[PDB]
Short mmCIF file of C-alpha atoms and ligand atoms in Angstrom, two decimals:
data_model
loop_
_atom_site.label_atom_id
_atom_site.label_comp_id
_atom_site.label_asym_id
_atom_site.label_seq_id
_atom_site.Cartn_x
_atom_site.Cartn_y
_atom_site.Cartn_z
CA UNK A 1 32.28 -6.67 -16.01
CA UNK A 2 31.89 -5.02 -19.34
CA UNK A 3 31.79 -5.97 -23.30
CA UNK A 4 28.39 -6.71 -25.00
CA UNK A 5 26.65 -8.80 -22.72
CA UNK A 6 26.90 -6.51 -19.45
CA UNK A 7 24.65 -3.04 -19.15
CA UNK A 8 7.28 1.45 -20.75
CA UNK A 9 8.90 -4.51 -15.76
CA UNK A 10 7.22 -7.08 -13.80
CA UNK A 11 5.84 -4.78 -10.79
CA UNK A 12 4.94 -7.15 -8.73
CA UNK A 13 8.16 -9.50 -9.36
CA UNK A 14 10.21 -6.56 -7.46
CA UNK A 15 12.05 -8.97 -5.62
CA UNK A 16 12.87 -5.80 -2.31
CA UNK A 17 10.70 -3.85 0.13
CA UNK A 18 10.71 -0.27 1.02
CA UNK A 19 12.52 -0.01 4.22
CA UNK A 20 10.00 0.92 6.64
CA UNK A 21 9.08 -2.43 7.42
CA UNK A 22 10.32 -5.97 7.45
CA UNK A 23 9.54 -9.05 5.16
CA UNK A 24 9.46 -12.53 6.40
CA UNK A 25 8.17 -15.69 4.02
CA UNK A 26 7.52 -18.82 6.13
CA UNK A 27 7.34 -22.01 4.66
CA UNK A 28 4.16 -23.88 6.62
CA UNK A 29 5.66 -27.28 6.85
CA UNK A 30 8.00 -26.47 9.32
CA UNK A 31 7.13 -22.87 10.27
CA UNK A 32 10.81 -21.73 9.54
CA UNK A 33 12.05 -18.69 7.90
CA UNK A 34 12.50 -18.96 4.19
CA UNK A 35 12.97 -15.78 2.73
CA UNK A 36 13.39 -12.26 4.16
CA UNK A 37 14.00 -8.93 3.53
CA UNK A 38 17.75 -7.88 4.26
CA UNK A 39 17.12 -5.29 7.00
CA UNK A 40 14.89 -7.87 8.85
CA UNK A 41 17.28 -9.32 12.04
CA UNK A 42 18.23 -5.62 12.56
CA UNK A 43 14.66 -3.84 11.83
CA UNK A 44 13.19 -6.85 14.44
CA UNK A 45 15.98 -6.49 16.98
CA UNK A 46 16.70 -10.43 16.39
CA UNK A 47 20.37 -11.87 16.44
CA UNK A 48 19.23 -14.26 13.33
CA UNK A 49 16.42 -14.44 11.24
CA UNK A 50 16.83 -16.63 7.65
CA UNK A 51 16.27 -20.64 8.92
CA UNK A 52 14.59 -19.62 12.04
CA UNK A 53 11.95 -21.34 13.10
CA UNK A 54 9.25 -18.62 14.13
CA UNK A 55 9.03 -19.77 17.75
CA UNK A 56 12.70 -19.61 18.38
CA UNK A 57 12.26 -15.95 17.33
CA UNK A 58 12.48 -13.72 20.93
CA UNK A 59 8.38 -12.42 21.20
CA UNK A 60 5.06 -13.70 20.41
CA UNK A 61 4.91 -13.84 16.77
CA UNK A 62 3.91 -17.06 16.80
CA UNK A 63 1.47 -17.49 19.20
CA UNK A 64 -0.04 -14.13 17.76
CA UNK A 65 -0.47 -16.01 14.66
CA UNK A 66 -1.51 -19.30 15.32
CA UNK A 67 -5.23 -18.72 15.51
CA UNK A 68 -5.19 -17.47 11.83
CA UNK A 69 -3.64 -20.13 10.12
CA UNK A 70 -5.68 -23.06 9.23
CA UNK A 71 -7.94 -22.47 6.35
CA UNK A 72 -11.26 -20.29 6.62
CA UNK A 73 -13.01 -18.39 3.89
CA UNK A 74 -13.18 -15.23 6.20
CA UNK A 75 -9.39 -15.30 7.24
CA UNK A 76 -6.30 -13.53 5.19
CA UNK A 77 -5.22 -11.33 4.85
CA UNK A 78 -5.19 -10.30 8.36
CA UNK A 79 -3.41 -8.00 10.65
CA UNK A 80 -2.29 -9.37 14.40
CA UNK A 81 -0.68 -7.47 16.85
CA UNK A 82 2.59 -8.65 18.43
CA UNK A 83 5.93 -8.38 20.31
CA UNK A 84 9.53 -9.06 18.71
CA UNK A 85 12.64 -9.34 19.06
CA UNK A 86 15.57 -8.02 22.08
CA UNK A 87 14.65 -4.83 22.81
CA UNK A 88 11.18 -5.92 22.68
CA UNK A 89 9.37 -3.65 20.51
CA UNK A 90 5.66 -3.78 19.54
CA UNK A 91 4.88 -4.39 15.65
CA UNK A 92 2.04 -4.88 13.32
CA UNK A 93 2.21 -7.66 11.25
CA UNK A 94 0.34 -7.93 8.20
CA UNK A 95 0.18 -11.64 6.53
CA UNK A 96 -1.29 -13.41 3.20
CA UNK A 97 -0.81 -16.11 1.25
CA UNK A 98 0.62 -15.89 -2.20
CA UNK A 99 -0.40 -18.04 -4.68
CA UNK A 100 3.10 -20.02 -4.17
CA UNK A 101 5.66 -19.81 -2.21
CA UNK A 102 4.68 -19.81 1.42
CA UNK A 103 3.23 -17.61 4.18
CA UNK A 104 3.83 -13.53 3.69
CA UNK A 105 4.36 -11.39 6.77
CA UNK A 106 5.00 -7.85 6.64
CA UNK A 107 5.97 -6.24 9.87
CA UNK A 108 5.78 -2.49 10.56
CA UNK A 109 6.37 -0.79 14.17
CA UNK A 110 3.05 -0.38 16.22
CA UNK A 111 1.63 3.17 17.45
CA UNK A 112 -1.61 3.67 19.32
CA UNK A 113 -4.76 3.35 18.55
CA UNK A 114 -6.56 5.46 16.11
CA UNK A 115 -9.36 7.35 17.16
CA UNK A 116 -11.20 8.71 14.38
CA UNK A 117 -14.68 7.17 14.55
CA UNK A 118 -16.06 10.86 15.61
CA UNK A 119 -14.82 11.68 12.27
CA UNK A 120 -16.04 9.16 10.38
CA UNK A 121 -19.93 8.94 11.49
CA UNK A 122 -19.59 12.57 9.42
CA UNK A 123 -17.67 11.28 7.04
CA UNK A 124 -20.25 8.87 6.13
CA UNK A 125 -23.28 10.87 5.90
CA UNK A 126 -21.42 13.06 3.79
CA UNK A 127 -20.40 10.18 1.46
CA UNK A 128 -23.94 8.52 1.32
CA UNK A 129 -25.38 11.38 0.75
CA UNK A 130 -23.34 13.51 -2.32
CA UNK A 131 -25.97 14.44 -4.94
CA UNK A 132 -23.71 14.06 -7.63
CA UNK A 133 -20.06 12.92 -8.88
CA UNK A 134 -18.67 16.35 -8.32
CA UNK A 135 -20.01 16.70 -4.88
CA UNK A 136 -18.44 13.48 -3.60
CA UNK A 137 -15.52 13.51 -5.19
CA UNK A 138 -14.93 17.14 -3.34
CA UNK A 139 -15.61 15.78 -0.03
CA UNK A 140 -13.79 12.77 -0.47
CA UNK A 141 -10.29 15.08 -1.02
CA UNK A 142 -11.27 16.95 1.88
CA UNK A 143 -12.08 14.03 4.33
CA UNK A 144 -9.15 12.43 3.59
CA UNK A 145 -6.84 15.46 3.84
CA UNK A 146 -8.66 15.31 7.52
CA UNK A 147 -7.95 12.11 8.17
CA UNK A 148 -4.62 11.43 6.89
CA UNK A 149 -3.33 15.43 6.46
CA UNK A 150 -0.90 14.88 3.67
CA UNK A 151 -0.01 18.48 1.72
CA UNK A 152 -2.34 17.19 -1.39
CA UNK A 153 -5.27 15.23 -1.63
CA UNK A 154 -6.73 14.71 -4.96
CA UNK A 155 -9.02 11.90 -6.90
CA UNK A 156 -7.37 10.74 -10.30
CA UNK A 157 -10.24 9.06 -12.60
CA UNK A 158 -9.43 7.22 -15.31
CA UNK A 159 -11.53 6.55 -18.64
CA UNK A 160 -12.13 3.78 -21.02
CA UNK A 161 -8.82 4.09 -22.47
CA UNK A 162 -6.89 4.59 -19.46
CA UNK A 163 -5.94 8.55 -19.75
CA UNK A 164 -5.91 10.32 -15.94
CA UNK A 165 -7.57 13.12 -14.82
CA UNK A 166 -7.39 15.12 -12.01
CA UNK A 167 -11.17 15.44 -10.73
CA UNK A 168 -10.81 16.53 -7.40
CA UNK A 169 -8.18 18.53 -5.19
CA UNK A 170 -7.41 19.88 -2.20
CA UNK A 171 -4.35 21.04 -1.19
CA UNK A 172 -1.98 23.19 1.77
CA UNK A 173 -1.99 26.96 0.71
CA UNK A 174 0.20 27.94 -1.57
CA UNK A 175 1.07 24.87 -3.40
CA UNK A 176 0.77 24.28 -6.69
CA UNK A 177 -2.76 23.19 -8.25
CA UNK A 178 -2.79 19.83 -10.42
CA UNK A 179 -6.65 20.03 -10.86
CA UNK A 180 -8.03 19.49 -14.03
CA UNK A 181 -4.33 18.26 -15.30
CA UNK A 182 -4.70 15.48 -17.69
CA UNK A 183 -2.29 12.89 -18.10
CA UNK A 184 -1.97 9.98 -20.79
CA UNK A 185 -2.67 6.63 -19.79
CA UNK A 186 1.25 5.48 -19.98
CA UNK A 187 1.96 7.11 -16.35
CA UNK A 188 -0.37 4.58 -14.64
CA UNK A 189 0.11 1.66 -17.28
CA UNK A 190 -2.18 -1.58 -17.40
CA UNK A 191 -0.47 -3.71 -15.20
CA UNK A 192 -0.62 -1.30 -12.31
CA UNK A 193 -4.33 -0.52 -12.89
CA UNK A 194 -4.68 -4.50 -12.52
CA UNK A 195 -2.57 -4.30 -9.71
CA UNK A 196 -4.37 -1.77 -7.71
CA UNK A 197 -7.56 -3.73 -8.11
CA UNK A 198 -6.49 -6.30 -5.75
CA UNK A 199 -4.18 -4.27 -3.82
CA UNK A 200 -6.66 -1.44 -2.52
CA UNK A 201 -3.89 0.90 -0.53
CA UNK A 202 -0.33 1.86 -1.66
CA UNK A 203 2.00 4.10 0.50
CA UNK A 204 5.09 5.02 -0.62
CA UNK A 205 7.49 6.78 2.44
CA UNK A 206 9.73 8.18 1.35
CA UNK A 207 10.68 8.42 -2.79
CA UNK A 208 14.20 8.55 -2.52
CA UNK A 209 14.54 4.98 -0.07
CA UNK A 210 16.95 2.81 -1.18
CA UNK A 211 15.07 -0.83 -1.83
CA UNK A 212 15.81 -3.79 0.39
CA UNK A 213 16.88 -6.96 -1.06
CA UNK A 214 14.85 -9.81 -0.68
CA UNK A 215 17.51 -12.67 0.96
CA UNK A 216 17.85 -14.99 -1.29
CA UNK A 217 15.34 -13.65 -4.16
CA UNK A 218 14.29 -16.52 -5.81
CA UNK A 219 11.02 -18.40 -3.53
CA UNK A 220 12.90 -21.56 -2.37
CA UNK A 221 9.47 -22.86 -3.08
CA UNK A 222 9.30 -22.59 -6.68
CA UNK A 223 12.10 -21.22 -7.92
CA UNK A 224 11.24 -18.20 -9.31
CA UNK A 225 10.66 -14.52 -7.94
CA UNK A 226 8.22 -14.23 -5.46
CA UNK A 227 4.92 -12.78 -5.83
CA UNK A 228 4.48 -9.62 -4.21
CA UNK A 229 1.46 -8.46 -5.63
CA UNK A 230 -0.05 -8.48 -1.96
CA UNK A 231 3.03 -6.79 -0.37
CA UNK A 232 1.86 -3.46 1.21
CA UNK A 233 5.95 -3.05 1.29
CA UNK A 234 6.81 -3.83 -2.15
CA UNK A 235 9.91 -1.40 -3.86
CA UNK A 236 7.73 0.49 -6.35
CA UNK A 237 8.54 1.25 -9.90
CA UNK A 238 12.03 3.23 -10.63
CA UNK A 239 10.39 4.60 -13.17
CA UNK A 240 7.16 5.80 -10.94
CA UNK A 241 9.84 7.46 -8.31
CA UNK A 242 11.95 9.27 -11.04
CA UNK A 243 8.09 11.03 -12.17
CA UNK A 244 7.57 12.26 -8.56
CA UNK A 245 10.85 13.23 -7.90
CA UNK A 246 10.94 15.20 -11.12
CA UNK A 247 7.66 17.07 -8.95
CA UNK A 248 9.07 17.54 -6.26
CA UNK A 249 6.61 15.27 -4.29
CA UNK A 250 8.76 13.04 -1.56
CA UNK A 251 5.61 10.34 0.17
CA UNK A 252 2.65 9.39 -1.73
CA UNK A 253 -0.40 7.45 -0.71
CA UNK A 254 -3.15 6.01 -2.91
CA UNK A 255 -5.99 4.29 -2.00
CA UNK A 256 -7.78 2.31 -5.02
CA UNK A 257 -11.35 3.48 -6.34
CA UNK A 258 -13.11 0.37 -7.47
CA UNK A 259 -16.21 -0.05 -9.56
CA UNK A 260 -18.38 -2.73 -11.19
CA UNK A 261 -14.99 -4.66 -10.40
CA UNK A 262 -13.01 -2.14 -12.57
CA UNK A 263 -10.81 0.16 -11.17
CA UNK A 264 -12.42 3.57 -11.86
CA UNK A 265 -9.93 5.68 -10.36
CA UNK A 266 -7.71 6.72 -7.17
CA UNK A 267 -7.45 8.92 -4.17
CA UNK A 268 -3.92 10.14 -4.50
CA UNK A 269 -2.21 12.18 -1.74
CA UNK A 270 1.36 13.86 -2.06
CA UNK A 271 3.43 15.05 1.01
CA UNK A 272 6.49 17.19 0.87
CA UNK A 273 8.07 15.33 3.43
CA UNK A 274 8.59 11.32 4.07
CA UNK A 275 5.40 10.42 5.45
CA UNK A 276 3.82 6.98 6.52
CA UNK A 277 0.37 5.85 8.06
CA UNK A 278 -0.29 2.95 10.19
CA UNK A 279 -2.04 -0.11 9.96
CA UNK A 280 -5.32 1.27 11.39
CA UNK A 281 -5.56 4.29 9.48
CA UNK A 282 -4.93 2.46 6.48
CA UNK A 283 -8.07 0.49 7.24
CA UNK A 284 -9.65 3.61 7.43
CA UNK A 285 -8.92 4.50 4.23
CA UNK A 286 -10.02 1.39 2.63
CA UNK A 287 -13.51 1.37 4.40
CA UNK A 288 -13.92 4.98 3.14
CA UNK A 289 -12.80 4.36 -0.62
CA UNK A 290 -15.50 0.88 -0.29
CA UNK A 291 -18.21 3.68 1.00
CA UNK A 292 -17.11 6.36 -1.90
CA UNK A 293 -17.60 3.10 -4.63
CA UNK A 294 -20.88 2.40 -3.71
CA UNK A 295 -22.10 6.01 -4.01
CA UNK A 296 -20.32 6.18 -7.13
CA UNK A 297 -22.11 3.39 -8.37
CA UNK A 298 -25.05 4.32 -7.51
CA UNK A 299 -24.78 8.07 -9.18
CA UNK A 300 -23.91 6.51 -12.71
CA UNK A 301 -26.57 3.68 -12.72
C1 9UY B 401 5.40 1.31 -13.58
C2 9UY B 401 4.56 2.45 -13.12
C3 9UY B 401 4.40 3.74 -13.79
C4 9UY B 401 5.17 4.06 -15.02
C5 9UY B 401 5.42 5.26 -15.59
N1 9UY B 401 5.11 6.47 -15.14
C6 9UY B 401 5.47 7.43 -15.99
O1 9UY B 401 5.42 8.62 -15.77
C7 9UY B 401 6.03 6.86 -17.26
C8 9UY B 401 5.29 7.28 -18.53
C9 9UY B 401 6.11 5.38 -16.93
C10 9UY B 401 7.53 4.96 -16.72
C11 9UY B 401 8.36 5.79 -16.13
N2 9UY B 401 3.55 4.56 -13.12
C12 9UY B 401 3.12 3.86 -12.02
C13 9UY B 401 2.17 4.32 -10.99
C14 9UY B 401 1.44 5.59 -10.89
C15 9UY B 401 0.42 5.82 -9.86
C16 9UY B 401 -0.06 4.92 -8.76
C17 9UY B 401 0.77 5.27 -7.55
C18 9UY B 401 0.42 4.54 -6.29
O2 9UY B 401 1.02 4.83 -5.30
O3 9UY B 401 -0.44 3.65 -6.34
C19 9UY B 401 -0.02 7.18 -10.09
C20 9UY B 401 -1.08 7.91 -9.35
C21 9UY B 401 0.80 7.61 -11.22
C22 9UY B 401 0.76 8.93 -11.86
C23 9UY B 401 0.57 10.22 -11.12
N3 9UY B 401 0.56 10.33 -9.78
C24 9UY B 401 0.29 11.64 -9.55
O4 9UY B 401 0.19 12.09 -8.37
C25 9UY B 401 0.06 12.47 -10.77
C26 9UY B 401 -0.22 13.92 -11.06
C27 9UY B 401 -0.57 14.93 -10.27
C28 9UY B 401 0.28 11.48 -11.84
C29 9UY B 401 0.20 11.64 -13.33
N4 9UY B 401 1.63 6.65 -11.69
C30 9UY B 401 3.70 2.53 -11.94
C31 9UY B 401 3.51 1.46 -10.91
C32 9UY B 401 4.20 1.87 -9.59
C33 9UY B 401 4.17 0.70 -8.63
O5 9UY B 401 5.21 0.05 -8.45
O6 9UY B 401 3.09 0.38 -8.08
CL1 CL B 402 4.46 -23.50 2.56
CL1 CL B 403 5.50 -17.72 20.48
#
């Protein structure tokens, strides 16, 4: 198709998932399959997926579930822990409710246990005690370089008119240094500051993925796209992946930096090579970026 009518986005609207994981929506009614992510009946290892009710689906999804799912103010989002799908495989299945448009669950494949609390008690000390902004923000790029050992760890503050800055970094010998580096508030634009308020940890595996259709886009629910602002798989930006691939940087992961309910800045970390963290370690990361916000506010009051 061509002539006039054929040929800085609503982030959260992206309509695909990074393929790393897979995407069910379940409508609550019935506890069938309503939407999901294109790769999802070969990524789970399951013959059919789209109309299925979720226990007809080979594992324990649903039984994994079940206690989570009537109301409670201390309940989603919440991780479970389950079996799916012929080969059986163990996943990690993170699920919230959007505001419409059913139940969200976000399956990635399980690893073991994380051991790190030896780390952390350290990691802690070191937080609650930093005498200054300079001091923590230096330890906080080198405990999470430790913890998560990405090439580049660096914190990325933003001021009252957005602009970036480059506060803090640590990074592998011999790579280039971004500290210091000021960028203008256009290459993390409003919406995604918003964004990253709610949504606390981003990780992006690998920047040149090719983005997985959401089957059939629209919510069946409402009619419109579906809202993936709480989608830890969410296709990012085009625009975001064409600035790191014009670095050079191939796996990112971010981890929001949030104070007096405004988002102060990030912990950004670049690898060289596609690179993902788990479910547990990404829990980590949270509870140390809640810790770092505390002592943060507590330095500028
Ligand atoms: C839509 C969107 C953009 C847009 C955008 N970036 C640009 O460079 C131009 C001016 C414009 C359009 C092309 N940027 C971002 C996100 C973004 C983040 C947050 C990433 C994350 O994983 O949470 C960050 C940190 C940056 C900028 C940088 N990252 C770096 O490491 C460095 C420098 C060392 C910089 C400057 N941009 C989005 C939203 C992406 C999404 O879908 O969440
Ligand atoms: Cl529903
Ligand atoms: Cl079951």
């Amino acid at each position: 198709v061509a002539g006039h009518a054929s040929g800085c986005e609503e982030i959260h609207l992206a309509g695909s998932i990074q393929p790393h994981g897979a995407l069910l929506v379940v409508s609550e009614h019935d506890h069938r399959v309503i939407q999901a992510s294109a790769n999802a009946a070969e990524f789970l290892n399951l013959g059919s997926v789209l109309g299925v009710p979720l226990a007809e689906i080979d594992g324990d999804l649903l039984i994994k579930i079940l206690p989570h799912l009537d109301p409670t103010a201390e309940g989603m989002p919440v991780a479970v822990r389950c079996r799916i799908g012929n080969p059986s495989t163990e996943y990690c299945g993170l699920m919230h409710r959007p505001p419409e448009g059913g139940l969200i669950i976000e399956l990635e494949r399980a690893g073991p246990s994380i051991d790190l609390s030896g780390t952390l008690a350290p990691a802690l000390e070191r937080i609650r005690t930093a005498g200054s902004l300079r001091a923590l923000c230096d330890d906080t790029v080198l405990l999470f370089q430790q913890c998560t050992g990405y090439d580049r760890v660096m914190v990325y503050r933003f001021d009252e008119q957005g602009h970036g800055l480059v506060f803090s970094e640590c990074h592998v010998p011999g790579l280039e240094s971004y500290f210091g580096n000021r960028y203008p508030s256009s290459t993390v634009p409003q919406m995604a500051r918003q964004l990253y308020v709610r949504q606390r940890v981003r990780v992006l595996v690998d920047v040149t993925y090719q983005p997985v259709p959401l089957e059939p886009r629209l919510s069946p629910l409402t009619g419109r796209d579906l809202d993936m602002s709480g989608c830890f798989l969410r296709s990012m930006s085009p625009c975001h992946l064409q600035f790191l691939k014009d670095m050079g940087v191939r796996a990112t992961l971010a981890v929001s930096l949030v104070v007096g309910g405004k988002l102060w800045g990030l912990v950004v970390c670049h690898h060289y090579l596609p690179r993902f963290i788990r479910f547990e370690l990404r829990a980590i990361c949270k509870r140390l970026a809640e810790r770092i916000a505390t002592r943060i506010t507590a330095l500028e009051s």
